UniProtKB/TrEMBL annotation, chain B:
A Pfam family assignment: Ribosomal_L13e
Name of the protein: 60S ribosomal protein L13
Entry's family note: Belongs to the eukaryotic ribosomal protein eL13 family.
InterPro entries xref list: Ribosomal_eL13, Ribosomal_eL13_CS
GO cellular component: cytosolic large ribosomal subunit
Domain of life: Eukaryota
Length: 148, 209
RNA sequence: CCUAGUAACGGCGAGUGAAGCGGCAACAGCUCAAAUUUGAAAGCUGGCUUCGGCCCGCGUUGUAAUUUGGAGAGGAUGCUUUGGGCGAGGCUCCUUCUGAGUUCCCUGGAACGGGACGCCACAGAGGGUGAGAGCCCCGUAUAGUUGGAAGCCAAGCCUGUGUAAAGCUCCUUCGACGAGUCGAGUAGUUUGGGAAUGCUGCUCAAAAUGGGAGGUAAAUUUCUUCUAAAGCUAAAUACCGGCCAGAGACCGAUAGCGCACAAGUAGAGUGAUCGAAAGAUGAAAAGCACUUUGAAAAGAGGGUUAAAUAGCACGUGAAAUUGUUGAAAGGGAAGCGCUUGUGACCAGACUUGCGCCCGGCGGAUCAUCCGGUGUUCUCACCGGUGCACUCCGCCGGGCUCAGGCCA
RNA sequence: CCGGGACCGAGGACCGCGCUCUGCAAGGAUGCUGGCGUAAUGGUCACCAGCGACCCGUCUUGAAACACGGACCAAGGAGUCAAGGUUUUGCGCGAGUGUUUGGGUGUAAAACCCGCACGCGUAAUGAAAGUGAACGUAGGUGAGAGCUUCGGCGCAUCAUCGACCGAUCCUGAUGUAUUCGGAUGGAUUUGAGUAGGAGCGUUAAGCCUUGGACCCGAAAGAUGGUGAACUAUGCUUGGAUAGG
RNA sequence: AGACUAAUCGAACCAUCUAGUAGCUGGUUACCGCCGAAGUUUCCCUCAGGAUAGCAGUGUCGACCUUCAGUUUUAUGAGGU
RNA sequence: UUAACUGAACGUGGGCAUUCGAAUGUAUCGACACUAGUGGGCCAUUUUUGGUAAGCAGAACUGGCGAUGCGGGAUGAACCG
RNA sequence: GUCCCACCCAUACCCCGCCCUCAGGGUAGAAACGAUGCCCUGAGGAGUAGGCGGCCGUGGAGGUCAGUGACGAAGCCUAGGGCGUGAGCCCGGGUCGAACGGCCUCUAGUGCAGAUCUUGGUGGUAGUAGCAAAUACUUCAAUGAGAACUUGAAGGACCGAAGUGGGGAAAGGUUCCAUGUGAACAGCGGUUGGACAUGGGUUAGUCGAUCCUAAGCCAUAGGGAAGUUCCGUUUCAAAGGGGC
RNA sequence: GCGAUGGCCAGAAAGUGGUGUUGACGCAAUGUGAUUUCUGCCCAGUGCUCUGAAUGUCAAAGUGAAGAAAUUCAACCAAGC
RNA sequence: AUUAACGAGAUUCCCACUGUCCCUAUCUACUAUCUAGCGAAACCACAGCCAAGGGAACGGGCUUGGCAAAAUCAGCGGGGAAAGAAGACCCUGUUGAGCUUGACUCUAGUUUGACAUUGUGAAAA
RNA sequence: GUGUGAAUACAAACCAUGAAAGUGUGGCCUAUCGAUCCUUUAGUCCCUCGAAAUUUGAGGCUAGAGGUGCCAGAAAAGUUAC
RNA sequence: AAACUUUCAACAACGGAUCUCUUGGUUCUGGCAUCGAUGAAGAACGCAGCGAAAUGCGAUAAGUAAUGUGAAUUGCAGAAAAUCAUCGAAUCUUUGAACGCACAUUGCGCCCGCCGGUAUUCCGGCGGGCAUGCCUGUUCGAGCGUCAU
């Protein structure tokens, strides 16, 4: 809102807070990113190291769908189970059944191994799996199976 | 002219953008017009549903591979298996797509069953009331609770496979012999080395002569 | 909408910059060339015609039927399919029609204002009427209704009929498919398209599981996907330019369009063009009769009006600037600050209020008790009692207290 | 220890330090008296008087300047809006968050309701292929608010030594499609990482960029039109110029 | 003669692109309260301008920890005016 | 690392104060965030460099004016207070 | 020149009152409080560029004040008051005639002395510069309110046939004629006027245009050009007129 | 400078145009500037003009070689120098 | 180089001539002047007496002195660092434009080569 | 407390030299020099050419070189008396 | 002491600010698709009892027909609706893409028909016609381009 702005407070004061010596001219220093390798080099080097130059190779017609593989950690693996069934498993009212989790159905392609796992068998169907995640599932007593 | 720690500005307003600004103050009025057009076309299609029957289709890429949705129309093979003539399908509310193919028995069977359910639920009024033919509903089962939205009454029942399933222990499958991670590494390596191994094998085979 | 300010382009600087997928709105599919009707140009324009046809012309260097790759053609095979006419009834369209105060009192020139009493409301949107009107008037709400034209849709009926035409189920075989076109080179331009994204010019110039594409130039071998060089097609989309209509936390006559007005006018320029200023008396012209002075314009009386200092130089009527009247100052500026003085003109404060004794007047509660209600459950109220060594109020006298300004 | 004078009286029951203790000069003025009760005090204006007093705005080291603008008055007149970004406020929900592209609905541009996808966040690292985060009660040491059974428990955060993930360098096991695979542990390395998630949406402010971009101002450049009624040159057709 | 081409000529006039750009000149609108500068560093075809650090304000947060200091004393180094 | 537990570094456990080991002050300690203006300066003491010199030009330290009124120096940006 | 005494005054110092800022405390078995309040205590106050906070004012929106008003809203004037440090707010008197305001939120085209600012209006200068080229007017009479610049008569003068004469071309468009005339215009006046108003006025076989061709321009046939169109004018054209 | 298949020039192009109803006593382009008397030396430089071999330089197209092909490398060159 | 004739071309001298001058005077008309009528504009921070001082180093204002009396008319050119006109000289600007060239980068035209238009014969190794 | 140029101590290695100890990471010390883009080399069972292969070619990663002397690094002749 | 200048106040001037108003703009939203050789848009000139302009109209000229409504119009005059709404029938001057050729001319022609002057020929009056590109068709033709007798 205009009534909360500082221009209202600058009414009656010549130069509107822009100074008398420097006068708020049009574009001192240039427009946009002018002088990146010149008078603005000090800023462009203090911040944004690496602004200029090329690194790496090109990929013509990159289709982002080729690289779709969202990952989930084993610490949040059990959060994919519905809360009531998850509580039943964690408290131990099954111990004769195992949950089969479809990471692709939940929207994930790779299983990573960040967290810990409770000592409960569980079958995990994933496109990809990390070595640590696989090891941790096996030690918990389950198995991971590749499904594409 | 940058002056502090700023994200480098890249606002594409160096053309005369004001000449092509598209505001949307007509959003509610356009919605009202759309609703009026829908009501008019539904009234015109008095007993018929307002849309055509669509098949179930799997989204193409490796992303969205997991989900199904509605397609454009049923294939000629699906119509033939369901027993619906090609020229008769579009006149009874069925969308037909002549350029889609059934590469898999699963999709073929799913769409055929969909068509069969639609045909079982179809009520066909005779062209002339005073002389119905054998293919029309015989005026007795012509009264029933009908649907006017095939997109809802014949939607995608489950676009995604169930993400949770319980099996008993001792039914847990045995893992891949070397492990899943190793199996993936081995498959990747074989795919990388298929050509080099092939040329080396043929070279060693031909080295004798 | 998202993809995405991404892939990519860029003196890789400044900067630029798509697409596939995905969600949605809307969905609609088709017809030609390439075949012999060959047991019958079956096709079409024009003219005449009782309506049955006739004539000329076009056309075999190909007009109809069939076929368009999703196929189809040819055969089998048994099922299946079709043409016309009404039409209740409904939605439209034009048209007739719509509730309630002008009741009493005050102000006013005029109630549409204030007060009192009423009414209507599926209508208290808006406007007019002599000032803020639901009920004075037009309109406003509601589905109805008076009469009429017949525009659409349509339940269902009535009635032809398989020579012909049409679909499906199987099949050995056949299975025509667009050329200075694709493609290649080079040049220019363009693109995010990068050993070249599209387009165009020039040169070369195709093929028959061929050809194009598969985002790094090339040879070789595979694979995937479509089928160019012919054509038609609602909708969802843009647009307030045109014609209507409804609105706004917009502007309010130097604003808002240049234009609220005889505005793209008056006027300027040879011309292309440029291009203003300018709204408001009053409810009603009732727009000042008549007398008098003046050559006249006008003035002075008088009249109209609620009002003329509202008189067509017209609502209100600021400042700059000016005239008259009154007061004051002024020996080469004035204005201004602090502080008195003089003169002029003023706002407040005060003119009482509290108490206590002594008399007069009036009244009926003053304590207490009884009953009924309320409430904070112990504190009140309302009735009955009281009934004058109480209580309250008003006068008269005395005393006390405080209360203005300067000392 | 006695006088003489000036300016001032803030506070508003008691409370406290105390003294020369029936009281007091001790945590801030009372008592008595007089005149007037109105223009008397007081305010405003005009003028005289004493002292003081350069014309404002601006650029500037420096302005009253012999620096520029300003004769006067009325009205108009200049940091806005949008997108994107950032930090800090206030909100809602929270490992999630965001209804409003759209649909439903409506007393109809409002309000209300719905969900698939999607964006951002939840995982980083490398040019990329790719790989991808716990030895420990999610570690040890020193601090550390606050709790404590008084023995220590130790938030946030800071310093420090370690551990884990990706990358880079080293080696280089069991194996082998014998040229592939890359176990184990080791780096004076390196990362916008992990190590009991903080984000998403929205509101307000400052700041940044592009935009007309606080307002007014060039000399120029370009596209498309209009002029030889002046004047220049030429063509066609005409006219005019005493007396010596 | 850079003369003339409608008072316009070292490139006419009209309209538009166009509110062209300006590191340059001018201006930039109520009051009170608190705090309160810089003309210096480095880089820039930088020298009438920018960025960068410094000086300044505001908002906080932390145990505001028992520390901090344009100072003296004591002890102990360096210097070449 | 050394010939070696012998050193280096980091610690465990125990002890110190009848006094936390000069003075003075503490009228403010530290960390963080975001950002304004400024980036023409000038004057003076002392030390100066160039110059014959300059109300000239250029430096070091400190204090000033700029940004500041007030008393004094009659008159004044810097002098004295 | 040196030494001594008393005295004068800064916005400095000391004591006191008040304002604000900053800081530190008290205030609930609430007899309690714009707790955002009140009470107690201490210190401090310069300021351009600039930052921040709090407030005043303006147009419009929601809510509210059962708000004000034709028995007078808004606006305007005011050597009449009151409040606030101030921006401002309120009231008295006059004018006037139809709407308007306070409070809390919301909103912005929201506050002017400047910009050789924009538009409009108005001053001093100032009854001033000036109204002096083209030889020149005078007498009587009429008219009229009014006569140097109207008219009649008379006189005196100029233009002196390359004219201040008589007619035309371009250009103007009614200025031509009659009648009447208030204002405006005729830079003095005005009875007069190319002014204003009301009515009239331009007569062709022979005068011109019309006909012809000139310089030149535009078609056509054709050829260029994406095209607006360019060339072409007799050119690579099947291009007509005489009688029975 | 030019004898028309041309010189100089205009045009976006043209089956276009000017010189040109022209033809060297002409058309076009320059310098000097009546008459008189004269107009000397210099072709190294920059131009213009003429020859492009015993001489060197070169593009596209074309030729040869290598290659699997893209390509690469070799010779050859018209104008111009 | 010279040159008759010509020249509103530049220059020196001589005769004549004269107010150019010594050295000014006088006359005429029309103004100015005064009056009736009519009636602007430029310009204007506020204004208008000086001397010195200091000051942005040349004051109308400030300091210290001199002084200082209404309201006015005709002239006048000392001052108002008087009015025009955002200095045209000079410098700065990463502002232009006209012109030049062996500046940088291009370009109409032009020259030459190649391909196409482009066909049919013969001869020469 | 950014680059650049220089410089200092130590670690990984494997070398030179002296019987050793030790010294040596250019010149006894204080100057002697150069970004992005592009190009060219050197480095490997390294990565990519995105339908799948092989071979050319191309593109990446790490380290040098070709240079900006206006040396934190534009590609640049005059005249104006109009 | 007046006058003059200045200051202050009342009244009167000058001017058009302020307030209030608004048949106007501006912006958004919704509906609709309809110009022209059957002569458009635009231009010119005319038309009313008394009009210059604006608006409307076209020699049938401030309008005619037709339908609906139902008593006006109004400044005056006049008369027996209306300056009304609607609108399907007409009129529609000179032009203009503009069309016989032109046009800086109210210029100059040709064809058909009728009516007059002795008239197929000249003159006058009236009516209807005469542009270009292209398509289909008709008819009349050209060419040793070509086919049979
Ligand atoms: Mg300030
Ligand atoms: Mg300024
Ligand atoms: Mg600045
Ligand atoms: Mg622009
Ligand atoms: Mg490109
Ligand atoms: Mg672009
Ligand atoms: Mg009614
Ligand atoms: Mg009455
Ligand atoms: Mg009433
Ligand atoms: Mg009403
Ligand atoms: Mg095809
Ligand atoms: Mg190209
Ligand atoms: Mg182009
Ligand atoms: Mg290309
Ligand atoms: Mg590929
Ligand atoms: Mg497919
Ligand atoms: Mg096609
Ligand atoms: Mg089409
Ligand atoms: Mg206007
Ligand atoms: Mg006006
Ligand atoms: Mg206007
Ligand atoms: Mg004109
Ligand atoms: Mg008015
Ligand atoms: Mg009045
Ligand atoms: Mg009035
Ligand atoms: Mg008035
Ligand atoms: Mg006044
Ligand atoms: Mg006084
Ligand atoms: Mg007094
Ligand atoms: Mg003084
Ligand atoms: Mg200066
Ligand atoms: Mg000043
Ligand atoms: Mg001076
Ligand atoms: Mg200056
Ligand atoms: Mg200046
Ligand atoms: Mg001035
Ligand atoms: Mg206004
Ligand atoms: Mg104003
Ligand atoms: Mg601007
Ligand atoms: Mg901006
Ligand atoms: Mg401009
Ligand atoms: Mg220009
Ligand atoms: Mg340019
Ligand atoms: Mg042009
Ligand atoms: Mg002429
Ligand atoms: Mg003669
Ligand atoms: Mg010259
Ligand atoms: Mg002109
Ligand atoms: Mg001229
Ligand atoms: Mg020009
Ligand atoms: Mg112009
Ligand atoms: Mg301070
Ligand atoms: Mg540079
Ligand atoms: Mg400056
Ligand atoms: Mg020494
Ligand atoms: Mg030394
Ligand atoms: Mg600098
Ligand atoms: Mg800075
Ligand atoms: Mg300086
Ligand atoms: Mg500066
Ligand atoms: Mg100096
Ligand atoms: Mg300064
Ligand atoms: Mg000071
Ligand atoms: Mg002083
Ligand atoms: Mg104080
Ligand atoms: Mg202060
Ligand atoms: Mg507004
Ligand atoms: Mg009033
Ligand atoms: Mg009224
Ligand atoms: Mg404004
Ligand atoms: Mg003003
Ligand atoms: Mg100002
Ligand atoms: Mg005079
Ligand atoms: Mg004169
Ligand atoms: Mg005279
Ligand atoms: Mg005369
Ligand atoms: Mg008389
Ligand atoms: Mg006379
Ligand atoms: Mg004479
Ligand atoms: Mg003669
Ligand atoms: Mg005459
Ligand atoms: Mg004459
Ligand atoms: Mg003429
Ligand atoms: Mg007369
Ligand atoms: Mg006159
Ligand atoms: Mg007169
Ligand atoms: Mg007269
Ligand atoms: Mg008379
Ligand atoms: Mg006249
Ligand atoms: Mg004649
Ligand atoms: Mg004629
Ligand atoms: Mg032509
Ligand atoms: Mg042609
Ligand atoms: Mg010569
Ligand atoms: Mg030579
Ligand atoms: Mg030679
Ligand atoms: Mg050669
Ligand atoms: Mg001679
Ligand atoms: Mg004079
Ligand atoms: Mg006079
Ligand atoms: Mg003045
Ligand atoms: Mg003086
Ligand atoms: Mg002086
Ligand atoms: Mg002066
Ligand atoms: Mg005097
Ligand atoms: Mg003079
Ligand atoms: Mg003078
Ligand atoms: Mg002056
Ligand atoms: Mg200047
Ligand atoms: Mg510079
Ligand atoms: Mg230039
Ligand atoms: Mg020029
Ligand atoms: Mg280098
Ligand atoms: Mg380079
Ligand atoms: Mg590949
Ligand atoms: Mg280089
Ligand atoms: Mg440098
Ligand atoms: Mg007036
Ligand atoms: Mg017509
Ligand atoms: Mg015709
Ligand atoms: Mg015709
Ligand atoms: Mg003619
Ligand atoms: Mg006859
Ligand atoms: Mg015919
Ligand atoms: Mg023939």
């Amino acid at each position: 809102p205009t009534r909360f702005s500082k221009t209202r407070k600058h009414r009656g004061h010549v130069s509107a807070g822009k100074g008398r010596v420097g006068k708020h001219r049009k574009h001192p220093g240039g427009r946009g990113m002018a002088g990146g390798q010149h008078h603005h080099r000090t800023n462009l080097d203090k911040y944004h190291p690496g602004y200029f130059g090329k690194v790496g190779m090109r990929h013509f017609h990159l289709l982002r769908n080729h690289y779709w593989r969202p990952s989930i950690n084993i610490d949040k693996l059990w959060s994919l189970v519905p809360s009531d069934v998850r509580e039943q498993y964690l408290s131990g009212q099954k111990k004769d059944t195992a949950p089969v989790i479809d990471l692709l159905s939940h929207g994930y392609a790779k299983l990573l191994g960040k967290g810990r796992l409770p000592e409960i068998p569980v079958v995990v169907r994933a496109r990809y799996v990390s070595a640590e995640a696989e090891r941790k599932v096996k030690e918990a007593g389950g198995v991971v199976e590749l499904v594409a | 002219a940058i002056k502090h720690n700023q994200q480098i500005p890249n606002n594409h307003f160096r053309k005369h953008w004001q000449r092509r600004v598209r505001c949307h103050f007509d959003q509610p009025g356009k919605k009202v017009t759309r609703r009026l057009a829908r009501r008019a076309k539904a009234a015109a299609l008095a007993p018929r549903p307002v849309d055509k029957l669509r098949p179930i289709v799997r989204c193409p890429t490796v992303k969205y591979n997991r989900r199904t949705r509605l397609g454009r129309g049923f294939t000629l093979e699906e119509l033939k298996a369901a027993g619906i003539p090609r020229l008769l399908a579009p006149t009874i509310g069925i969308a037909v797509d002549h350029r889609r193919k059934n590469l898999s028995e699963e999709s073929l069977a799913a769409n055929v069953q969909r068509l069969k359910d639609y045909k079982a639920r179809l009520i066909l009024f005779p062209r002339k009331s005073n002389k119905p033919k054998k293919a029309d509903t015989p005026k007795d089962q012509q009264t029933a609770e009908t649907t006017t939205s095939l997109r809802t009454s014949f939607g995608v029942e489950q676009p995604l496979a169930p993400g949770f399933t319980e099996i008993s222990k001792s039914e847990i499958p045995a893992g891949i012999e070397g492990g899943a991670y190793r199996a993936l590494r081995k498959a990747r390596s074989d795919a990388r080395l298929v050509g080099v191994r092939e040329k080396r094998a043929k070279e060693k085979a031909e080295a004798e002569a």
